[PDB]
Coordinates of C-alpha atoms and ligand atoms in Angstrom, one line a residue:
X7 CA 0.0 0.0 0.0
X8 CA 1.2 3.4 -1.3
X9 CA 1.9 5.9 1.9
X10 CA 0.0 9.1 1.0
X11 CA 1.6 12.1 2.7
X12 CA -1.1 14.4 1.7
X13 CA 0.9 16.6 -0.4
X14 CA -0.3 15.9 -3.9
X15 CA -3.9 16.1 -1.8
X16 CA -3.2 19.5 -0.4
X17 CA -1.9 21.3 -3.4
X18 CA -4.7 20.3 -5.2
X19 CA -6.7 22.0 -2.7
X20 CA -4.8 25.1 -2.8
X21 CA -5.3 25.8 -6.0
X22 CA -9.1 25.1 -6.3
X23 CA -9.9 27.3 -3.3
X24 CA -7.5 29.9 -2.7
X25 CA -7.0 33.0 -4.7
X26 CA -4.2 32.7 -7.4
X27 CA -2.7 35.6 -5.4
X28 CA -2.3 33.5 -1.9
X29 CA 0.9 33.1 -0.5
X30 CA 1.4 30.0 1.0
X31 CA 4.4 28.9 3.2
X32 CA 6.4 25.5 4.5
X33 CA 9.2 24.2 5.8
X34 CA 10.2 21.6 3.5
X35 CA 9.9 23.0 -0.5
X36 CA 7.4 20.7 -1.5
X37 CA 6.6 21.9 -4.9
X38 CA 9.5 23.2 -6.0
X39 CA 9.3 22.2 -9.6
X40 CA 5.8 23.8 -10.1
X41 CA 5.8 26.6 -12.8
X42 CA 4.1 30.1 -12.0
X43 CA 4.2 33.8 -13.6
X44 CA 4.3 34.6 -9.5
X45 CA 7.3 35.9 -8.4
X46 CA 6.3 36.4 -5.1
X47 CA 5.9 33.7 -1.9
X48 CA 5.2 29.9 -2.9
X49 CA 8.3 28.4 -0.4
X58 CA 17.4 31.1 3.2
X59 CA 17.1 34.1 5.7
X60 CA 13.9 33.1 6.3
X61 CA 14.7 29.7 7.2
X62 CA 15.4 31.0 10.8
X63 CA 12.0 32.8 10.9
X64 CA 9.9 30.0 10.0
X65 CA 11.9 28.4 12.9
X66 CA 11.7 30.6 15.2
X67 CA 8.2 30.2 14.9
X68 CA 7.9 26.6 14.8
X69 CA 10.5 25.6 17.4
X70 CA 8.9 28.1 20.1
X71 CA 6.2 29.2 22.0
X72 CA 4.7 32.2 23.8
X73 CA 6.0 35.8 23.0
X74 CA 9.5 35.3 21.3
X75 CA 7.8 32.8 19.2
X76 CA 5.6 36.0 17.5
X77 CA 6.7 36.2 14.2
X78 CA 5.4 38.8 12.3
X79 CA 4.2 36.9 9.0
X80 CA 2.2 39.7 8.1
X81 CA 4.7 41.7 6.8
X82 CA 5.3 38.4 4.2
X83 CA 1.4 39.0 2.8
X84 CA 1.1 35.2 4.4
X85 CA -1.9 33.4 3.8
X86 CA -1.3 30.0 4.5
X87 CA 0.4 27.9 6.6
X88 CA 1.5 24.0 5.9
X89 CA 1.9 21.5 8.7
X90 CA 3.6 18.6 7.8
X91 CA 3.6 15.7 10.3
X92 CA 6.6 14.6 9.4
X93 CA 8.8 17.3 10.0
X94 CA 9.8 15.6 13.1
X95 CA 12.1 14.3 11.5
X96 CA 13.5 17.4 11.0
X97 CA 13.0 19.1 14.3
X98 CA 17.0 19.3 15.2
X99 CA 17.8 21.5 12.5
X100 CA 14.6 23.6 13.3
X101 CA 15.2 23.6 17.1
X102 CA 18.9 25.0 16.3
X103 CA 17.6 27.3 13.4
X104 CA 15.1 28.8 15.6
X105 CA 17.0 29.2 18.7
X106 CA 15.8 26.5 20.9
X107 CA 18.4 24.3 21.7
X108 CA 22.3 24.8 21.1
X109 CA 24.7 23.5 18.5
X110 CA 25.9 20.8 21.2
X111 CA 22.0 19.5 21.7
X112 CA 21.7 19.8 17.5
X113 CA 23.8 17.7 16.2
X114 CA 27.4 17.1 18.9
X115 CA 29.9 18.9 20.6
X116 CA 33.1 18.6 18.6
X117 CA 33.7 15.1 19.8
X118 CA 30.6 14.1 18.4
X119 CA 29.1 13.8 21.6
X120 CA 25.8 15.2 23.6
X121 CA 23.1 15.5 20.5
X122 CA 19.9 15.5 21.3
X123 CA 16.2 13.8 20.1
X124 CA 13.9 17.0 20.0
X125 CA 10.5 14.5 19.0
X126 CA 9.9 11.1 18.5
X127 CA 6.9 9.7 17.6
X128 CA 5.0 6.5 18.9
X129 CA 2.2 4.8 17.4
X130 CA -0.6 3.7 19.5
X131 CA -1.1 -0.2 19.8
X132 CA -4.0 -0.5 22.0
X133 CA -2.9 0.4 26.0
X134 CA 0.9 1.0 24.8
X135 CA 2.9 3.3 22.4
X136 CA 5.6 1.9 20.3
X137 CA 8.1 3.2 17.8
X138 CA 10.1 -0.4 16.5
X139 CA 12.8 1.4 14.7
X140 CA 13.7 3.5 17.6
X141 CA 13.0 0.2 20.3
X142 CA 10.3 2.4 22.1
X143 CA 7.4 1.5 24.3
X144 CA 5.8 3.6 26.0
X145 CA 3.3 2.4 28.6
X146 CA 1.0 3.4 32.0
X147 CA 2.3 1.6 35.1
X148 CA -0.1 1.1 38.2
X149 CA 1.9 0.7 41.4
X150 CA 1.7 2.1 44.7
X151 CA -2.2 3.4 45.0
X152 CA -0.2 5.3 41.5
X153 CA -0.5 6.3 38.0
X154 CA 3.3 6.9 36.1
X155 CA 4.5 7.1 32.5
X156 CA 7.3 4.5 31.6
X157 CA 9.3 4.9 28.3
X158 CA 11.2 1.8 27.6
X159 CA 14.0 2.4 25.6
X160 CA 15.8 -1.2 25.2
X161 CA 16.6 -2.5 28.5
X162 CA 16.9 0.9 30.0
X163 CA 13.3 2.1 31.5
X164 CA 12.8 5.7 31.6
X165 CA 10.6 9.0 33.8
X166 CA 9.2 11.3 31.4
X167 CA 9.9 14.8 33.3
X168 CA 6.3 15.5 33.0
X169 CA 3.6 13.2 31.0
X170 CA 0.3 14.8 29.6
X171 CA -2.7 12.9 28.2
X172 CA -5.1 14.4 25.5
X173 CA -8.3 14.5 25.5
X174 CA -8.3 15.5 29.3
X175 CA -4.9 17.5 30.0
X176 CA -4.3 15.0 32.6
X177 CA -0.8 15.8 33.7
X178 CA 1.6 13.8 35.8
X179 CA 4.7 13.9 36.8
X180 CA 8.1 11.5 36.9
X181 CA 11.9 12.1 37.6
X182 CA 13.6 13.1 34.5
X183 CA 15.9 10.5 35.0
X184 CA 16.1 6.4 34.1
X185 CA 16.2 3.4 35.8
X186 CA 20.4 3.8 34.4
X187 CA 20.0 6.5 36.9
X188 CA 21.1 9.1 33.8
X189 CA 18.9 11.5 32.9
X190 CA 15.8 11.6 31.2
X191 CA 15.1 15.2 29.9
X192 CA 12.0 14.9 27.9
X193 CA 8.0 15.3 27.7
X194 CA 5.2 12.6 27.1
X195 CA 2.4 13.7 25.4
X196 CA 0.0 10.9 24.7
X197 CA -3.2 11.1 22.5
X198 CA -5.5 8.4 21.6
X199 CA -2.8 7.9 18.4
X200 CA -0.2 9.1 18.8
X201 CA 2.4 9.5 21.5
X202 CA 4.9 12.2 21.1
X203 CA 8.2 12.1 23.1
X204 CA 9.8 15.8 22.9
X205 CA 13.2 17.4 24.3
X206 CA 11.8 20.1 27.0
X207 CA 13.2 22.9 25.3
X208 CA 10.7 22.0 22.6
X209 CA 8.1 20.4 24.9
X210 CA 5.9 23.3 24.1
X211 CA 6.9 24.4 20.8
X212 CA 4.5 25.9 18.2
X213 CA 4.8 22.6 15.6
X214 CA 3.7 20.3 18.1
X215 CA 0.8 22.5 19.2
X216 CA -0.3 22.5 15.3
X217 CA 1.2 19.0 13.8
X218 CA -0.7 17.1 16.6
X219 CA -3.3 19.3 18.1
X220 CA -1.5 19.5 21.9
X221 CA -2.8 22.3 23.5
X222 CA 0.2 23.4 26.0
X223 CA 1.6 26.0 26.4
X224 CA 4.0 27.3 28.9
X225 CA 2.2 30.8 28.5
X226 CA -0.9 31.4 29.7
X227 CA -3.4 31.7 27.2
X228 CA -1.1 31.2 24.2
X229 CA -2.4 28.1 22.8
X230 CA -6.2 28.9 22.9
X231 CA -4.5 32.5 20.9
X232 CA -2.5 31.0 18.7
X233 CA -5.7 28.9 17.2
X234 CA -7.4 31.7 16.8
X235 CA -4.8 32.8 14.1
X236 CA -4.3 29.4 12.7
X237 CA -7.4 28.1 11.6
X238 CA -7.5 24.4 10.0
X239 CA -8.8 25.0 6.7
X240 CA -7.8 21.6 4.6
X241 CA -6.2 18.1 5.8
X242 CA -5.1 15.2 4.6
X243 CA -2.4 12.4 5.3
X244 CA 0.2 14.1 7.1
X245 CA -0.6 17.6 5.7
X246 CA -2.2 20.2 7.8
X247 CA -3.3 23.5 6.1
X248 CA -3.6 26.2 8.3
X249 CA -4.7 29.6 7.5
X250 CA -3.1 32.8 8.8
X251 CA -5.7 35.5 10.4
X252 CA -2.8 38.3 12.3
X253 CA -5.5 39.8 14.0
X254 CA -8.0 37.4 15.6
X255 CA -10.9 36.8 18.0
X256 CA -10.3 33.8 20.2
X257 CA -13.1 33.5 22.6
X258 CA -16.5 35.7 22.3
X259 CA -19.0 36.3 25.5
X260 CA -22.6 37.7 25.1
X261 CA -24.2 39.6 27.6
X262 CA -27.3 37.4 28.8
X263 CA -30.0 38.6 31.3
X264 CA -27.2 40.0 33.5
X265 CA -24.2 37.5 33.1
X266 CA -21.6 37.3 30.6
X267 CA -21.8 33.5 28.6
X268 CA -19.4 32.0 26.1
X269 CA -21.5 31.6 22.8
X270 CA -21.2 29.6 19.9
X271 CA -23.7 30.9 17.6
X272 CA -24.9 34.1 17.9
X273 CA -29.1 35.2 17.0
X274 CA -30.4 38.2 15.4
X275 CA -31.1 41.4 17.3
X276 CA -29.3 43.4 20.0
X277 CA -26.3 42.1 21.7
X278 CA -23.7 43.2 24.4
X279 CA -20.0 41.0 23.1
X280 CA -16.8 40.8 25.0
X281 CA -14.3 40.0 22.1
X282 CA -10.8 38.6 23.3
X283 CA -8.3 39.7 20.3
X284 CA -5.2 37.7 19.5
X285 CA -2.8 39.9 17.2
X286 CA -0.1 37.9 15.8
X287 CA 3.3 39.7 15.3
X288 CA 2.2 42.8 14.6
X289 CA 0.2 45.6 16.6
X290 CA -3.4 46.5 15.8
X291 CA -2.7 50.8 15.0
X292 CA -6.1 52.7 13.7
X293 CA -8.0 50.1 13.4
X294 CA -11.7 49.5 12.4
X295 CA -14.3 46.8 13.7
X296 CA -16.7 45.4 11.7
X297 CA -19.3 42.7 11.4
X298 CA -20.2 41.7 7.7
X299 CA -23.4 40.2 7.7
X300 CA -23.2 36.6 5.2
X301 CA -25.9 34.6 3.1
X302 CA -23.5 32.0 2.0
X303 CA -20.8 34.4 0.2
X304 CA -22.9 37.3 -0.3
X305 CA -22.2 40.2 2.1
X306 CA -25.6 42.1 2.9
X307 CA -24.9 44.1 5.4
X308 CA -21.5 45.5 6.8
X309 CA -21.8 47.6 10.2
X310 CA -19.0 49.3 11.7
X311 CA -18.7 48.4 15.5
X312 CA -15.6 49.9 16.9
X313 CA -12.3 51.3 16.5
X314 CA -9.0 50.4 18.3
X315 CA -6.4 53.3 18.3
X316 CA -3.4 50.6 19.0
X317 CA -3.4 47.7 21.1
X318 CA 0.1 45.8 21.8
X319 CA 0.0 42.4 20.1
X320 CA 1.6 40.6 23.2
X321 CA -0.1 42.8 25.7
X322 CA -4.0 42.2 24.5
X323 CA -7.1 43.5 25.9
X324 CA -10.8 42.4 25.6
X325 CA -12.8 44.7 24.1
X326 CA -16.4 45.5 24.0
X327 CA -19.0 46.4 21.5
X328 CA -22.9 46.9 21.3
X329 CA -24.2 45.4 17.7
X330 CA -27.1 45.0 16.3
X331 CA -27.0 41.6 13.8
X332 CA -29.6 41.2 11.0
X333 CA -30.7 38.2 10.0
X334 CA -28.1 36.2 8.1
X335 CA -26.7 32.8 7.5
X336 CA -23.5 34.1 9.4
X337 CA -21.4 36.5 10.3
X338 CA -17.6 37.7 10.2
X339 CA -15.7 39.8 12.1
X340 CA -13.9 41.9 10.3
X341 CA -10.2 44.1 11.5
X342 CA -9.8 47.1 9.1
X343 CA -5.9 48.8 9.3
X344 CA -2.8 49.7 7.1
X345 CA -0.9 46.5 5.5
X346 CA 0.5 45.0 2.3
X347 CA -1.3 43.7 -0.2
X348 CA -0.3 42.9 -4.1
X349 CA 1.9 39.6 -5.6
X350 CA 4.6 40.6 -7.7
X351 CA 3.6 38.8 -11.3
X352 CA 6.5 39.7 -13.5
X353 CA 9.9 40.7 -13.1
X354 CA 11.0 44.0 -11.7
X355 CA 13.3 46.3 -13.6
X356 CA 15.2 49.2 -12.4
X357 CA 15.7 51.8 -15.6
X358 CA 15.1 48.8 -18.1
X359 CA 17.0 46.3 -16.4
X360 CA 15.8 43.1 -14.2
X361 CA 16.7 43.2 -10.8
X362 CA 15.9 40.7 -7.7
X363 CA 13.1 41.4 -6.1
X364 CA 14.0 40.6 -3.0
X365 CA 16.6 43.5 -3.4
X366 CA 15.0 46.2 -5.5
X367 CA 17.9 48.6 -4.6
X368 CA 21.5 49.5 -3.4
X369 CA 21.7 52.6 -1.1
X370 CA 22.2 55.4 -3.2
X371 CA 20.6 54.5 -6.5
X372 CA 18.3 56.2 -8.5
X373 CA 15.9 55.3 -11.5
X374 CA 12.4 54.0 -13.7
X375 CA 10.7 51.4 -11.8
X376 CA 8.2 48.7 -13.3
X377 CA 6.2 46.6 -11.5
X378 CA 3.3 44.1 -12.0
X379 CA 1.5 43.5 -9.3
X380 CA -1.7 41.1 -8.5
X381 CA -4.5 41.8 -5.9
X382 CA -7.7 40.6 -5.4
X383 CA -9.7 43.6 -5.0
X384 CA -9.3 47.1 -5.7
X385 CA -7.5 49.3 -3.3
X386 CA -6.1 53.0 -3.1
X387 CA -2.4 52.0 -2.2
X388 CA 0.7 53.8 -1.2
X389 CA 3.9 52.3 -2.4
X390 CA 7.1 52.7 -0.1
X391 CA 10.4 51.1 -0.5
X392 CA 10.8 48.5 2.6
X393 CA 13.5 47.4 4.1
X394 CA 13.8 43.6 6.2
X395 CA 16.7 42.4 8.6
X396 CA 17.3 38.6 9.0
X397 CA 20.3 38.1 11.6
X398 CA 20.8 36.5 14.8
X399 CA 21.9 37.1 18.2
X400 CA 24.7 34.0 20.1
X401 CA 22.9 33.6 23.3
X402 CA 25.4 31.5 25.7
X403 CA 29.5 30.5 24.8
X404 CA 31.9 32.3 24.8
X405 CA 32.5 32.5 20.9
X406 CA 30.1 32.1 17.8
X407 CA 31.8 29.1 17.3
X408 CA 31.3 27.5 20.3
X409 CA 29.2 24.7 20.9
X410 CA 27.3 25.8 24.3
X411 CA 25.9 28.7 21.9
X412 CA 22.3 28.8 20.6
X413 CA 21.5 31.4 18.4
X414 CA 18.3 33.5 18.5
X415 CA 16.6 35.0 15.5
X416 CA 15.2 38.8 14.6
X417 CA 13.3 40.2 12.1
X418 CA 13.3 43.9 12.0
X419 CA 11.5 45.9 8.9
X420 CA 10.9 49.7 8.7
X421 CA 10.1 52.0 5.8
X422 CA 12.8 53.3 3.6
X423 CA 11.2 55.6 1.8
X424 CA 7.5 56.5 0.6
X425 CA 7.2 56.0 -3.8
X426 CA 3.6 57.4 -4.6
X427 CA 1.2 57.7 -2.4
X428 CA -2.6 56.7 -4.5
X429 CA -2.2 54.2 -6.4
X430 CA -5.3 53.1 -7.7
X431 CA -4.9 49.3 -7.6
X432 CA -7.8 47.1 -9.9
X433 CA -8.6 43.4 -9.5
X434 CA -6.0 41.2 -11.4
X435 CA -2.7 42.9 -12.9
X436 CA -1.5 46.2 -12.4
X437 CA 1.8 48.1 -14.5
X438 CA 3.4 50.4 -12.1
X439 CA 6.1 53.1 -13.2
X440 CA 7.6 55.4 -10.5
X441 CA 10.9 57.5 -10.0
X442 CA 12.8 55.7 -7.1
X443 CA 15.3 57.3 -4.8
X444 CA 17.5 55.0 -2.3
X445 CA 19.0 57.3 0.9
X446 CA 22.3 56.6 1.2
X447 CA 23.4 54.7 4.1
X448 CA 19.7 53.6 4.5
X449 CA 20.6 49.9 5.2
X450 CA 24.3 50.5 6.3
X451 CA 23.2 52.9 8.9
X452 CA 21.1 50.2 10.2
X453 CA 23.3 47.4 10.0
X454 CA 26.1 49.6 12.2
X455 CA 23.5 50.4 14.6
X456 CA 23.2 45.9 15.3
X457 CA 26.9 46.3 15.2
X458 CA 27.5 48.8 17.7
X459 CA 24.3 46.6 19.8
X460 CA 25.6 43.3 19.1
X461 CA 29.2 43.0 18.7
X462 CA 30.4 39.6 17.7
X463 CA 27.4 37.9 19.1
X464 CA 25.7 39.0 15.7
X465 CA 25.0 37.2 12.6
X466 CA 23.3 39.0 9.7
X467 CA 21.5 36.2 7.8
X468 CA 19.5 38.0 5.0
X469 CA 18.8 42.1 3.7
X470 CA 15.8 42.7 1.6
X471 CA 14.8 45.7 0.4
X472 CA 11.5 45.7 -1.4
X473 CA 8.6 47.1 -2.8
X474 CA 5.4 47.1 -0.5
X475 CA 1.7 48.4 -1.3
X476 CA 0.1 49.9 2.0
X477 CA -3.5 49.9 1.8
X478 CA -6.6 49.6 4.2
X479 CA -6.9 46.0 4.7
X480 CA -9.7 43.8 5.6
X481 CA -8.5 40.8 8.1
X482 CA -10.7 37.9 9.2
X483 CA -11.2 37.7 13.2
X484 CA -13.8 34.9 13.2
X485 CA -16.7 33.5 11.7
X486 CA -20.0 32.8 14.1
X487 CA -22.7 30.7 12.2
X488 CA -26.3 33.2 13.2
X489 CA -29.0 30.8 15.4
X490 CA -32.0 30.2 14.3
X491 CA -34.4 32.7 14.7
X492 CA -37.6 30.6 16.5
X493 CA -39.6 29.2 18.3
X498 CA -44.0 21.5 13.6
X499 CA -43.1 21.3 9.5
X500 CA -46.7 19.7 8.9
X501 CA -47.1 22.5 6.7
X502 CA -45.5 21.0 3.8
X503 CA -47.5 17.7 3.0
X504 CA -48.5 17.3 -0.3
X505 CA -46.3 20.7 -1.7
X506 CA -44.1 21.1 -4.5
Ligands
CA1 CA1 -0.1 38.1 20.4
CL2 CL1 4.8 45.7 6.3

């Protein structure tokens, strides 16, 4: 029997339902040899983003993916396989735990995976059983690892959360630094410093966190969308409601669905990577994919996207098959779908421009709607930061990723933008020392402990965006169906 990945599944389903402007993202370049007119984002700098999101959790693990025009997100099961090299791209474990010291020594398993045979995990190629022990009035978790029996630090069993504890250490008395997480399938053995890493929240649905709140968050802006073998699609929402209360004969109530009429909502925002700045609320009212009524319900002048706060509105919902919550703010928008030339001549287009230069730009750009956009010139910092040794070269060191972008320079400010292609010409003026002034200033910061990975400096259209917060299906509105015998 063939072993279907869900690869071929999931790019099929990409391009029948997503716009052929999307931007979809991965680890592994799945689809490498597929032809487009897009050159923009289909999946080396940005290596140690996507790993700094995968491999982490809670705050550092914020990534701001907006600033990519991200739409969607692939989860592929088997990228355990390559969890080292993410762990050490994004910061979470050091070159020692990654792959040796220079003796070879002291690497590191960051996941394993067990498959459930009934009462018992097992993993034949890496000799594992995992098991529940009774003893002593007592619940524990024992991983058998050939003859050696071994403590998880801390075990945790889904559905439930049922967590329970264990020495870190083996029967060998050496010790035993990992995590247990068991489902009703799977059992996942991770390395603590990625116990509670992003990939394992969204490649096998574990809801931990060390953060509180950050899981329940983080699904907010990752929304299953498609599945299939191994293959998780996940879409990206930046700004996103997680949780919504109505305000019912005196008490505040988590609600699914919401009815028509008058209501009092508590709306608990995650923003991913990126702040909420002028923002608009709405609520579009839906039949199906018909928008028939859009009502404006609040504005937030800036909220700090790992600082959230609730935020309350009074709305009055027509009736409608279901309604979306919309953020409204500044962001990019716009696929580039042909080269880019600087007077006449192709450049890359992840570097538009050298500090200093001057010239005729042409652009082709997609979008999905029309928009009044402003055009700047934007620049993007990849580099990292050693965190421990004494040396960049030493093995002690892990290394932890940034991504810094600011605005070089404004192009044109109204652009009229139309649904499909748009040819763009504009005069374009790089500031000196634009980027050198800001790679001394990470030098002067950093010293030797810094590592520029990537410098892009690229075109951007700024427009007022529309961003999905969440979906709530309307109830129905009252209150026999005998009515119908002998119709039609
Ligand atoms: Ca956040
Ligand atoms: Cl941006």
């Amino acid at each position: 029997e063939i072993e279907v990945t869900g690869w071929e599944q999931a790019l099929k389903w990409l391009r029948s339902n997503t716009s052929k402007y999307a931007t979809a993202t991965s680890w592994w370049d799945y689809g490498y040899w597929i032809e487009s007119s897009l050159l923009g984002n289909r999946r080396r700098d940005r290596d140690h983003i996507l790993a700094l999101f995968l491999a982490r959790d809670g705050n550092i693990s914020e990534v701001d993916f907006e600033s990519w025009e991200l739409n969607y997100f692939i989860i592929y099961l088997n990228d355990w396989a390559k969890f080292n090299a993410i762990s050490y791209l994004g910061g979470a474990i050091t070159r020692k735990e990654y792959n040796g010291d220079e003796n070879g020594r002291g690497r590191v398993t960051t996941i394993l995976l067990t498959q459930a045979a009934g009462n018992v995990y097992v993993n034949p190629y890496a000799r594992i059983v995992i098991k529940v022990i009774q003893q002593n009035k007592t619940r524990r978790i024992a991983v058998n690892i050939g003859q050696l029996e071994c403590s998880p630090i801390l075990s945790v069993a889904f559905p439930g959360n049922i967590k329970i504890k264990g020495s870190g250490r083996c029967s060998d008395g050496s010790p035993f630094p990992y995590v247990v997480y068991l489902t009703p399938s799977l059992g996942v053995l991770a390395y603590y410093k990625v116990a509670t890493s992003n990939f394992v929240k969204l490649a096998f649905g574990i809801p931990t966190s060390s953060y509180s709140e950050f899981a329940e968050k983080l699904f907010s802006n990752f929304i299953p969308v498609y599945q299939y073998g191994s293959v998780i699609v996940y879409e990206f929402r930046p700004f996103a409601i997680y949780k919504i209360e109505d305000f019912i004969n005196g008490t505040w109530r988590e609600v699914g669905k919401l009815s028509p009429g008058k209501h009092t909502l508590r709306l608990y925002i995650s923003a991913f990577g990126r702040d909420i700045k002028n923002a608009t609320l709405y609520v579009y009212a839906l039949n199906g994919t018909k928008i028939i009524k859009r009502i404006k319900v609040g504005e937030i002048k800036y909220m700090n996207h790992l600082e959230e706060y609730p935020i309350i509105v009074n709305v009055t919902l027509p009736t409608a098959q279901k309604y979306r919550f919309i953020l409204a703010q500044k962001g990019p928008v716009g696929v580039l779908t042909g080269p880019v030339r600087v007077n006449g001549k192709i450049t890359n287009p992840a570097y538009i421009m050298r500090e200093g230069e001057s010239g005729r730009l042409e652009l082709k750009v997609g979008v999905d709607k029309e928009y009044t956009a402003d055009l700047y010139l934007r620049a993007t910092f990849i580099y990292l930061v050693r965190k421990g040794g004494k040396s960049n070269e030493d093995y002690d060191a892990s290394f932890e990723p940034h991504m810094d972008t600011f605005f070089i320079t404004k192009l044109k400010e109204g652009i009229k933008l139309r649904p499909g292609e748009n040819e763009i010409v504009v005069n374009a003026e790089m500031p000196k020392n634009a980027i050198s002034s800001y790679k001394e200033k990470l030098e002067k910061e950093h010293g030797d402990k810094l590592i520029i990975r990537g410098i892009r400096v690229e075109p951007v259209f700024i427009v007022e965006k529309e961003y999905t917060m969440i979906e709530v299906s309307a109830s129905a509105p009252h209150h026999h169906h005998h009515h119908h015998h002998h119709h039609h």
